[PDB]
Amino acid sequence: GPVLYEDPPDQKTSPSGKSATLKICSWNVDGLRAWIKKKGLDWVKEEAPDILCLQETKCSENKLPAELQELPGLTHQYWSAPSDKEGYSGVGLLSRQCPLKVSYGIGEEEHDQEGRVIVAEFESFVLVTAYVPNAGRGLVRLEYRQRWDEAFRKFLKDLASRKPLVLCGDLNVAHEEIDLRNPKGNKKNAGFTPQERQGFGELLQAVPLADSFRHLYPNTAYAYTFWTYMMNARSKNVGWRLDYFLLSHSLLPALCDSKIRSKALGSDHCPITLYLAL
Amino acid sequence: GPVLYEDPPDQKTSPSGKSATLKICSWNVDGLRAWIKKKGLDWVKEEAPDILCLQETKCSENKLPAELQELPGLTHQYWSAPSDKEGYSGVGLLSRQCPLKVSYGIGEEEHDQEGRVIVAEFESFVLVTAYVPNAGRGLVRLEYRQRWDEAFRKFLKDLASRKPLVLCGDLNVAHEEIDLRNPKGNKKNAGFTPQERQGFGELLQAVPLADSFRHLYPNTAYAYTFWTYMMNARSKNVGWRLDYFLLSHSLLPALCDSKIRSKALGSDHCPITLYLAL
DNA sequence: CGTAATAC
DNA sequence: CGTAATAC
């Protein structure tokens, strides 16, 4: 039998003792419209997060279903979609409260053409949600992905100097061997090449950022956020951890918990939730 | 019962009496690789044409199956595919003999980015194969299609001044009501809008070119070259004539026949064959 | 390899 | 609405 993973209960109190005051939820919906048909929005209303980040929406701004506009609580909504590619990439950020400033992309024309980054600045921190480019089957985009990784790292380092940073989304890499079920087989596959894993480790050390889930559960294995639709991967928990909450070190005393909502359906990714005490 | 169409026998002698010396075949394969799996190449070897034009190949140059390189007779092969779009558009031209000159596109940067035109110049005439942009569901590209139509018309008029011209391929318009099964329903659908039909009539008169099939069969109805995969259109012969051989008037004394190979499978389009006596 | 999405 | 093709 396959070894399954049960995410531990929500810890809503920081180590300092302060109660959690902010609840961010991130989910790669892999088809915003199909995700809504599969009752994804119902799960969101059940989670009731202060902020909701979505990746791989595959939805142009004009094609957004009407129910999203009428969603309760998360009234302030921002979307980014590729200029010239239909049904590809795309992210979104939905918040209960209005952000002070909202910008798009990372400032480099080469990397801002697929709608992968939304930046939402708040009084106490800056939230970035990202959908990092996949290296592709055959590694056709691995050279581009290394260029992106370097540009994205410099971008986040500049943001982090002025304000504490929270980064979330599909970062499209399993950092370590614990972060995917079959590491020996995937050393040359997109998501686990040495170039991608190194860029991730360089990102954590340069900005600097910490992997919230791994920080709290350093030896917890079999904890994935993605399973291919093929070969019953999700039934057999043959997965990858591609979806992260990376925090600035100064927010670590405010970190309460980082969750993996393994049971939530509607995508080949599952949602992840962050609890902070600000 | 639906009214079916039987293409009359091949007339291989021109009205002047000269025997046919050139046999051009054009086919919108709508998926070059799927077309080869469906034994499309076998049909080509059975037709044995001097020149073979293909449209909507949906195949990048590096992904072309190996059997195409080893095809007998049609050894000189030229392909055009979109720069930035995978599995979209694309044409090809295969000839028994080497052409004097082979160029790509129509010379306008805006219209040469999807690989829709190949021009093959020969001693006695210039052959153009085209895959004209579809106006799209909802007519999103109808404004662009009118701009293309004007640029393409001027391009062909310049070619025709120096040499007699033969144009073939999917021109993505049913000229007249006879050219599609349900004209009253499609007046606002891509392929039969007033803008597309007028651009086609302006093309015939400006260059000038003649519709070879319609020239030879002025009152022959129910003669289509395309049927949607949906709703058993091909079984019920609910079709469109979108694929043409348009000739310069000076080649009309050399015109022997223009055929519609209704029974040839492998695509939602069927092939068309032209016989000339040069 | 499953699924969602495009284009026609 | 069928089919082929993409991207993951």
JSON list of C-alpha atoms in Angstrom, two decimals, chain A residues 57-239:
[
{"chain": "A", "resi": 57, "resn": "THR", "atom": "CA", "xyz": [-5.84, 30.50, -14.08]},
{"chain": "A", "resi": 58, "resn": "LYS", "atom": "CA", "xyz": [-5.77, 29.95, -17.88]},
{"chain": "A", "resi": 59, "resn": "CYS", "atom": "CA", "xyz": [-8.41, 32.67, -18.12]},
{"chain": "A", "resi": 60, "resn": "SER", "atom": "CA", "xyz": [-8.32, 35.97, -19.96]},
{"chain": "A", "resi": 61, "resn": "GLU", "atom": "CA", "xyz": [-9.59, 38.92, -17.95]},
{"chain": "A", "resi": 62, "resn": "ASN", "atom": "CA", "xyz": [-12.71, 39.30, -20.13]},
{"chain": "A", "resi": 63, "resn": "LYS", "atom": "CA", "xyz": [-13.61, 35.59, -19.73]},
{"chain": "A", "resi": 64, "resn": "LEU", "atom": "CA", "xyz": [-13.67, 35.58, -15.91]},
{"chain": "A", "resi": 65, "resn": "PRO", "atom": "CA", "xyz": [-16.90, 33.94, -14.67]},
{"chain": "A", "resi": 66, "resn": "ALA", "atom": "CA", "xyz": [-19.44, 36.26, -13.10]},
{"chain": "A", "resi": 67, "resn": "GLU", "atom": "CA", "xyz": [-19.57, 34.40, -9.76]},
{"chain": "A", "resi": 68, "resn": "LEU", "atom": "CA", "xyz": [-15.99, 35.52, -9.08]},
{"chain": "A", "resi": 69, "resn": "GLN", "atom": "CA", "xyz": [-17.00, 39.18, -9.19]},
{"chain": "A", "resi": 70, "resn": "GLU", "atom": "CA", "xyz": [-19.81, 38.45, -6.70]},
{"chain": "A", "resi": 71, "resn": "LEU", "atom": "CA", "xyz": [-17.59, 36.45, -4.33]},
{"chain": "A", "resi": 72, "resn": "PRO", "atom": "CA", "xyz": [-18.11, 37.44, -0.67]},
{"chain": "A", "resi": 73, "resn": "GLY", "atom": "CA", "xyz": [-15.32, 38.84, 1.46]},
{"chain": "A", "resi": 74, "resn": "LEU", "atom": "CA", "xyz": [-12.64, 38.75, -1.25]},
{"chain": "A", "resi": 75, "resn": "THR", "atom": "CA", "xyz": [-14.07, 41.78, -3.04]},
{"chain": "A", "resi": 76, "resn": "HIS", "atom": "CA", "xyz": [-10.81, 43.43, -4.18]},
{"chain": "A", "resi": 77, "resn": "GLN", "atom": "CA", "xyz": [-9.62, 41.30, -7.09]},
{"chain": "A", "resi": 78, "resn": "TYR", "atom": "CA", "xyz": [-6.60, 41.62, -9.38]},
{"chain": "A", "resi": 79, "resn": "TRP", "atom": "CA", "xyz": [-5.76, 39.43, -12.37]},
{"chain": "A", "resi": 80, "resn": "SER", "atom": "CA", "xyz": [-2.83, 39.06, -14.76]},
{"chain": "A", "resi": 81, "resn": "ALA", "atom": "CA", "xyz": [-2.97, 37.10, -18.00]},
{"chain": "A", "resi": 82, "resn": "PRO", "atom": "CA", "xyz": [-0.54, 36.71, -20.91]},
{"chain": "A", "resi": 83, "resn": "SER", "atom": "CA", "xyz": [-0.73, 39.37, -23.58]},
{"chain": "A", "resi": 84, "resn": "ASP", "atom": "CA", "xyz": [-0.63, 37.04, -26.60]},
{"chain": "A", "resi": 85, "resn": "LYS", "atom": "CA", "xyz": [-1.38, 33.54, -25.25]},
{"chain": "A", "resi": 86, "resn": "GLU", "atom": "CA", "xyz": [-4.94, 32.33, -24.66]},
{"chain": "A", "resi": 87, "resn": "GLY", "atom": "CA", "xyz": [-5.61, 29.70, -22.02]},
{"chain": "A", "resi": 88, "resn": "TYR", "atom": "CA", "xyz": [-2.03, 29.76, -20.76]},
{"chain": "A", "resi": 89, "resn": "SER", "atom": "CA", "xyz": [-0.50, 30.73, -17.42]},
{"chain": "A", "resi": 90, "resn": "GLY", "atom": "CA", "xyz": [-2.12, 33.63, -15.55]},
{"chain": "A", "resi": 91, "resn": "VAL", "atom": "CA", "xyz": [-2.47, 34.47, -11.88]},
{"chain": "A", "resi": 92, "resn": "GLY", "atom": "CA", "xyz": [-4.83, 36.29, -9.57]},
{"chain": "A", "resi": 93, "resn": "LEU", "atom": "CA", "xyz": [-4.92, 37.82, -6.10]},
{"chain": "A", "resi": 94, "resn": "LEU", "atom": "CA", "xyz": [-8.14, 38.37, -4.11]},
{"chain": "A", "resi": 95, "resn": "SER", "atom": "CA", "xyz": [-8.16, 40.25, -0.80]},
{"chain": "A", "resi": 96, "resn": "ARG", "atom": "CA", "xyz": [-10.66, 41.20, 1.88]},
{"chain": "A", "resi": 97, "resn": "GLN", "atom": "CA", "xyz": [-8.93, 44.55, 2.41]},
{"chain": "A", "resi": 98, "resn": "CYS", "atom": "CA", "xyz": [-7.66, 47.02, -0.16]},
{"chain": "A", "resi": 99, "resn": "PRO", "atom": "CA", "xyz": [-3.86, 46.92, -0.62]},
{"chain": "A", "resi": 100, "resn": "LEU", "atom": "CA", "xyz": [-1.85, 50.13, -0.53]},
{"chain": "A", "resi": 101, "resn": "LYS", "atom": "CA", "xyz": [-0.32, 49.42, -3.95]},
{"chain": "A", "resi": 102, "resn": "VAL", "atom": "CA", "xyz": [-0.71, 46.67, -6.55]},
{"chain": "A", "resi": 103, "resn": "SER", "atom": "CA", "xyz": [1.76, 46.13, -9.41]},
{"chain": "A", "resi": 104, "resn": "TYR", "atom": "CA", "xyz": [2.36, 43.41, -12.01]},
{"chain": "A", "resi": 105, "resn": "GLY", "atom": "CA", "xyz": [5.44, 41.53, -13.16]},
{"chain": "A", "resi": 106, "resn": "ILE", "atom": "CA", "xyz": [9.06, 41.88, -12.07]},
{"chain": "A", "resi": 107, "resn": "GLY", "atom": "CA", "xyz": [10.02, 44.92, -14.16]},
{"chain": "A", "resi": 108, "resn": "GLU", "atom": "CA", "xyz": [11.89, 43.06, -16.93]},
{"chain": "A", "resi": 109, "resn": "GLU", "atom": "CA", "xyz": [10.07, 43.09, -20.27]},
{"chain": "A", "resi": 110, "resn": "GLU", "atom": "CA", "xyz": [11.25, 39.58, -21.15]},
{"chain": "A", "resi": 111, "resn": "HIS", "atom": "CA", "xyz": [9.61, 38.07, -18.05]},
{"chain": "A", "resi": 112, "resn": "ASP", "atom": "CA", "xyz": [6.44, 40.19, -17.75]},
{"chain": "A", "resi": 113, "resn": "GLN", "atom": "CA", "xyz": [4.73, 38.90, -20.90]},
{"chain": "A", "resi": 114, "resn": "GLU", "atom": "CA", "xyz": [2.98, 35.81, -19.46]},
{"chain": "A", "resi": 115, "resn": "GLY", "atom": "CA", "xyz": [1.21, 37.22, -16.39]},
{"chain": "A", "resi": 116, "resn": "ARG", "atom": "CA", "xyz": [2.93, 35.21, -13.66]},
{"chain": "A", "resi": 117, "resn": "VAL", "atom": "CA", "xyz": [3.47, 37.73, -10.84]},
{"chain": "A", "resi": 118, "resn": "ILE", "atom": "CA", "xyz": [1.20, 40.02, -8.84]},
{"chain": "A", "resi": 119, "resn": "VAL", "atom": "CA", "xyz": [2.63, 42.19, -6.04]},
{"chain": "A", "resi": 120, "resn": "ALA", "atom": "CA", "xyz": [0.31, 43.47, -3.29]},
{"chain": "A", "resi": 121, "resn": "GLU", "atom": "CA", "xyz": [1.84, 45.89, -0.78]},
{"chain": "A", "resi": 122, "resn": "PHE", "atom": "CA", "xyz": [0.27, 46.30, 2.66]},
{"chain": "A", "resi": 123, "resn": "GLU", "atom": "CA", "xyz": [1.13, 48.44, 5.68]},
{"chain": "A", "resi": 124, "resn": "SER", "atom": "CA", "xyz": [3.16, 45.75, 7.44]},
{"chain": "A", "resi": 125, "resn": "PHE", "atom": "CA", "xyz": [4.41, 43.51, 4.61]},
{"chain": "A", "resi": 126, "resn": "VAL", "atom": "CA", "xyz": [4.45, 42.97, 0.86]},
{"chain": "A", "resi": 127, "resn": "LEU", "atom": "CA", "xyz": [2.81, 39.88, -0.62]},
{"chain": "A", "resi": 128, "resn": "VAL", "atom": "CA", "xyz": [4.00, 38.39, -3.92]},
{"chain": "A", "resi": 129, "resn": "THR", "atom": "CA", "xyz": [2.22, 35.54, -5.65]},
{"chain": "A", "resi": 130, "resn": "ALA", "atom": "CA", "xyz": [4.04, 33.82, -8.48]},
{"chain": "A", "resi": 131, "resn": "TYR", "atom": "CA", "xyz": [3.57, 31.10, -11.09]},
{"chain": "A", "resi": 132, "resn": "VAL", "atom": "CA", "xyz": [7.18, 30.35, -12.02]},
{"chain": "A", "resi": 133, "resn": "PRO", "atom": "CA", "xyz": [7.79, 29.14, -15.62]},
{"chain": "A", "resi": 134, "resn": "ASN", "atom": "CA", "xyz": [7.92, 25.37, -16.02]},
{"chain": "A", "resi": 135, "resn": "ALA", "atom": "CA", "xyz": [11.09, 24.02, -17.61]},
{"chain": "A", "resi": 136, "resn": "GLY", "atom": "CA", "xyz": [8.96, 21.97, -20.00]},
{"chain": "A", "resi": 137, "resn": "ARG", "atom": "CA", "xyz": [9.10, 18.40, -21.19]},
{"chain": "A", "resi": 138, "resn": "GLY", "atom": "CA", "xyz": [12.52, 17.84, -22.71]},
{"chain": "A", "resi": 139, "resn": "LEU", "atom": "CA", "xyz": [13.83, 20.88, -20.78]},
{"chain": "A", "resi": 140, "resn": "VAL", "atom": "CA", "xyz": [13.28, 23.22, -23.74]},
{"chain": "A", "resi": 141, "resn": "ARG", "atom": "CA", "xyz": [12.81, 26.20, -21.39]},
{"chain": "A", "resi": 142, "resn": "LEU", "atom": "CA", "xyz": [15.48, 25.32, -18.81]},
{"chain": "A", "resi": 143, "resn": "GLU", "atom": "CA", "xyz": [17.80, 28.01, -20.17]},
{"chain": "A", "resi": 144, "resn": "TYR", "atom": "CA", "xyz": [14.99, 30.56, -19.94]},
{"chain": "A", "resi": 145, "resn": "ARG", "atom": "CA", "xyz": [14.01, 29.32, -16.47]},
{"chain": "A", "resi": 146, "resn": "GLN", "atom": "CA", "xyz": [17.53, 29.98, -15.19]},
{"chain": "A", "resi": 147, "resn": "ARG", "atom": "CA", "xyz": [17.36, 33.55, -16.53]},
{"chain": "A", "resi": 148, "resn": "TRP", "atom": "CA", "xyz": [13.94, 34.05, -14.90]},
{"chain": "A", "resi": 149, "resn": "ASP", "atom": "CA", "xyz": [15.22, 32.62, -11.60]},
{"chain": "A", "resi": 150, "resn": "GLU", "atom": "CA", "xyz": [18.05, 35.18, -11.55]},
{"chain": "A", "resi": 151, "resn": "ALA", "atom": "CA", "xyz": [15.78, 38.10, -12.45]},
{"chain": "A", "resi": 152, "resn": "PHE", "atom": "CA", "xyz": [13.12, 37.02, -9.95]},
{"chain": "A", "resi": 153, "resn": "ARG", "atom": "CA", "xyz": [15.73, 36.64, -7.20]},
{"chain": "A", "resi": 154, "resn": "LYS", "atom": "CA", "xyz": [17.06, 40.17, -7.71]},
{"chain": "A", "resi": 155, "resn": "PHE", "atom": "CA", "xyz": [13.51, 41.55, -7.85]},
{"chain": "A", "resi": 156, "resn": "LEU", "atom": "CA", "xyz": [12.51, 39.94, -4.54]},
{"chain": "A", "resi": 157, "resn": "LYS", "atom": "CA", "xyz": [15.75, 41.04, -2.88]},
{"chain": "A", "resi": 158, "resn": "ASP", "atom": "CA", "xyz": [14.98, 44.68, -3.71]},
{"chain": "A", "resi": 159, "resn": "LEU", "atom": "CA", "xyz": [11.44, 44.38, -2.32]},
{"chain": "A", "resi": 160, "resn": "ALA", "atom": "CA", "xyz": [12.68, 42.69, 0.84]},
{"chain": "A", "resi": 161, "resn": "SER", "atom": "CA", "xyz": [15.09, 45.51, 1.71]},
{"chain": "A", "resi": 162, "resn": "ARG", "atom": "CA", "xyz": [12.26, 48.01, 2.18]},
{"chain": "A", "resi": 163, "resn": "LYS", "atom": "CA", "xyz": [9.53, 45.76, 3.63]},
{"chain": "A", "resi": 164, "resn": "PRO", "atom": "CA", "xyz": [9.09, 42.23, 5.00]},
{"chain": "A", "resi": 165, "resn": "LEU", "atom": "CA", "xyz": [8.13, 39.85, 2.22]},
{"chain": "A", "resi": 166, "resn": "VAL", "atom": "CA", "xyz": [5.74, 36.92, 1.81]},
{"chain": "A", "resi": 167, "resn": "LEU", "atom": "CA", "xyz": [6.02, 34.87, -1.38]},
{"chain": "A", "resi": 168, "resn": "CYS", "atom": "CA", "xyz": [3.51, 32.19, -2.34]},
{"chain": "A", "resi": 169, "resn": "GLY", "atom": "CA", "xyz": [2.42, 30.16, -5.33]},
{"chain": "A", "resi": 170, "resn": "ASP", "atom": "CA", "xyz": [3.61, 27.45, -7.68]},
{"chain": "A", "resi": 171, "resn": "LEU", "atom": "CA", "xyz": [7.39, 27.87, -7.68]},
{"chain": "A", "resi": 172, "resn": "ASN", "atom": "CA", "xyz": [7.72, 24.79, -9.95]},
{"chain": "A", "resi": 173, "resn": "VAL", "atom": "CA", "xyz": [10.54, 23.06, -8.11]},
{"chain": "A", "resi": 174, "resn": "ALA", "atom": "CA", "xyz": [10.81, 20.40, -5.45]},
{"chain": "A", "resi": 175, "resn": "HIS", "atom": "CA", "xyz": [13.63, 21.77, -3.31]},
{"chain": "A", "resi": 176, "resn": "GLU", "atom": "CA", "xyz": [14.95, 18.55, -1.78]},
{"chain": "A", "resi": 177, "resn": "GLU", "atom": "CA", "xyz": [14.53, 14.82, -2.21]},
{"chain": "A", "resi": 178, "resn": "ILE", "atom": "CA", "xyz": [11.95, 14.80, 0.57]},
{"chain": "A", "resi": 179, "resn": "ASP", "atom": "CA", "xyz": [9.83, 17.17, -1.55]},
{"chain": "A", "resi": 180, "resn": "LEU", "atom": "CA", "xyz": [8.82, 14.55, -4.15]},
{"chain": "A", "resi": 181, "resn": "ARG", "atom": "CA", "xyz": [7.92, 10.87, -4.04]},
{"chain": "A", "resi": 182, "resn": "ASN", "atom": "CA", "xyz": [10.36, 9.54, -6.67]},
{"chain": "A", "resi": 183, "resn": "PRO", "atom": "CA", "xyz": [13.50, 11.72, -6.52]},
{"chain": "A", "resi": 184, "resn": "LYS", "atom": "CA", "xyz": [15.92, 9.24, -8.12]},
{"chain": "A", "resi": 185, "resn": "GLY", "atom": "CA", "xyz": [13.81, 9.09, -11.30]},
{"chain": "A", "resi": 186, "resn": "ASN", "atom": "CA", "xyz": [13.23, 12.82, -11.77]},
{"chain": "A", "resi": 187, "resn": "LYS", "atom": "CA", "xyz": [16.78, 14.20, -11.57]},
{"chain": "A", "resi": 188, "resn": "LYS", "atom": "CA", "xyz": [16.55, 15.19, -15.27]},
{"chain": "A", "resi": 189, "resn": "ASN", "atom": "CA", "xyz": [12.83, 16.08, -15.35]},
{"chain": "A", "resi": 190, "resn": "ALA", "atom": "CA", "xyz": [11.36, 19.57, -15.10]},
{"chain": "A", "resi": 191, "resn": "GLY", "atom": "CA", "xyz": [10.82, 20.44, -11.45]},
{"chain": "A", "resi": 192, "resn": "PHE", "atom": "CA", "xyz": [13.87, 18.64, -10.04]},
{"chain": "A", "resi": 193, "resn": "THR", "atom": "CA", "xyz": [16.88, 19.43, -12.27]},
{"chain": "A", "resi": 194, "resn": "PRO", "atom": "CA", "xyz": [20.04, 20.67, -10.51]},
{"chain": "A", "resi": 195, "resn": "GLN", "atom": "CA", "xyz": [19.54, 24.10, -12.10]},
{"chain": "A", "resi": 196, "resn": "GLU", "atom": "CA", "xyz": [16.04, 24.54, -10.69]},
{"chain": "A", "resi": 197, "resn": "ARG", "atom": "CA", "xyz": [16.84, 23.21, -7.21]},
{"chain": "A", "resi": 198, "resn": "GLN", "atom": "CA", "xyz": [19.95, 25.38, -6.97]},
{"chain": "A", "resi": 199, "resn": "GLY", "atom": "CA", "xyz": [18.09, 28.50, -8.07]},
{"chain": "A", "resi": 200, "resn": "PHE", "atom": "CA", "xyz": [15.61, 27.79, -5.29]},
{"chain": "A", "resi": 201, "resn": "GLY", "atom": "CA", "xyz": [18.32, 27.42, -2.66]},
{"chain": "A", "resi": 202, "resn": "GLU", "atom": "CA", "xyz": [20.05, 30.56, -3.94]},
{"chain": "A", "resi": 203, "resn": "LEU", "atom": "CA", "xyz": [16.70, 32.36, -3.67]},
{"chain": "A", "resi": 204, "resn": "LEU", "atom": "CA", "xyz": [16.27, 31.36, -0.02]},
{"chain": "A", "resi": 205, "resn": "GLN", "atom": "CA", "xyz": [19.76, 32.60, 0.87]},
{"chain": "A", "resi": 206, "resn": "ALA", "atom": "CA", "xyz": [19.92, 35.78, -1.23]},
{"chain": "A", "resi": 207, "resn": "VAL", "atom": "CA", "xyz": [16.70, 37.60, -0.32]},
{"chain": "A", "resi": 208, "resn": "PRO", "atom": "CA", "xyz": [16.62, 35.95, 2.35]},
{"chain": "A", "resi": 209, "resn": "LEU", "atom": "CA", "xyz": [13.45, 33.85, 2.61]},
{"chain": "A", "resi": 210, "resn": "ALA", "atom": "CA", "xyz": [12.52, 30.75, 4.59]},
{"chain": "A", "resi": 211, "resn": "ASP", "atom": "CA", "xyz": [10.41, 27.77, 3.47]},
{"chain": "A", "resi": 212, "resn": "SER", "atom": "CA", "xyz": [7.57, 28.05, 5.98]},
{"chain": "A", "resi": 213, "resn": "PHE", "atom": "CA", "xyz": [6.35, 24.46, 5.77]},
{"chain": "A", "resi": 214, "resn": "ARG", "atom": "CA", "xyz": [9.84, 22.98, 5.85]},
{"chain": "A", "resi": 215, "resn": "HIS", "atom": "CA", "xyz": [10.83, 25.32, 8.69]},
{"chain": "A", "resi": 216, "resn": "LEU", "atom": "CA", "xyz": [7.97, 23.99, 10.83]},
{"chain": "A", "resi": 217, "resn": "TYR", "atom": "CA", "xyz": [8.17, 20.32, 9.73]},
{"chain": "A", "resi": 218, "resn": "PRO", "atom": "CA", "xyz": [11.86, 19.67, 8.98]},
{"chain": "A", "resi": 219, "resn": "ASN", "atom": "CA", "xyz": [11.54, 15.88, 8.76]},
{"chain": "A", "resi": 220, "resn": "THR", "atom": "CA", "xyz": [7.93, 15.48, 7.62]},
{"chain": "A", "resi": 221, "resn": "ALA", "atom": "CA", "xyz": [7.96, 13.47, 4.41]},
{"chain": "A", "resi": 222, "resn": "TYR", "atom": "CA", "xyz": [5.41, 12.46, 1.78]},
{"chain": "A", "resi": 223, "resn": "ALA", "atom": "CA", "xyz": [3.89, 15.96, 1.98]},
{"chain": "A", "resi": 224, "resn": "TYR", "atom": "CA", "xyz": [3.01, 17.00, -1.56]},
{"chain": "A", "resi": 225, "resn": "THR", "atom": "CA", "xyz": [0.92, 19.73, -3.19]},
{"chain": "A", "resi": 226, "resn": "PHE", "atom": "CA", "xyz": [0.79, 18.38, -6.77]},
{"chain": "A", "resi": 227, "resn": "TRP", "atom": "CA", "xyz": [0.00, 15.02, -8.39]},
{"chain": "A", "resi": 228, "resn": "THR", "atom": "CA", "xyz": [-0.16, 14.28, -12.10]},
{"chain": "A", "resi": 229, "resn": "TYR", "atom": "CA", "xyz": [-3.56, 13.35, -13.46]},
{"chain": "A", "resi": 230, "resn": "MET", "atom": "CA", "xyz": [-1.83, 10.34, -15.07]},
{"chain": "A", "resi": 231, "resn": "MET", "atom": "CA", "xyz": [-1.30, 6.91, -13.47]},
{"chain": "A", "resi": 232, "resn": "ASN", "atom": "CA", "xyz": [-3.49, 7.56, -10.38]},
{"chain": "A", "resi": 233, "resn": "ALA", "atom": "CA", "xyz": [-0.69, 9.59, -8.84]},
{"chain": "A", "resi": 234, "resn": "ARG", "atom": "CA", "xyz": [-3.01, 11.27, -6.34]},
{"chain": "A", "resi": 235, "resn": "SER", "atom": "CA", "xyz": [-4.63, 8.00, -5.25]},
{"chain": "A", "resi": 236, "resn": "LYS", "atom": "CA", "xyz": [-1.13, 6.57, -4.70]},
{"chain": "A", "resi": 237, "resn": "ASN", "atom": "CA", "xyz": [0.27, 9.88, -3.30]},
{"chain": "A", "resi": 238, "resn": "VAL", "atom": "CA", "xyz": [3.02, 9.98, -5.94]},
{"chain": "A", "resi": 239, "resn": "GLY", "atom": "CA", "xyz": [3.37, 13.74, -5.68]}
]
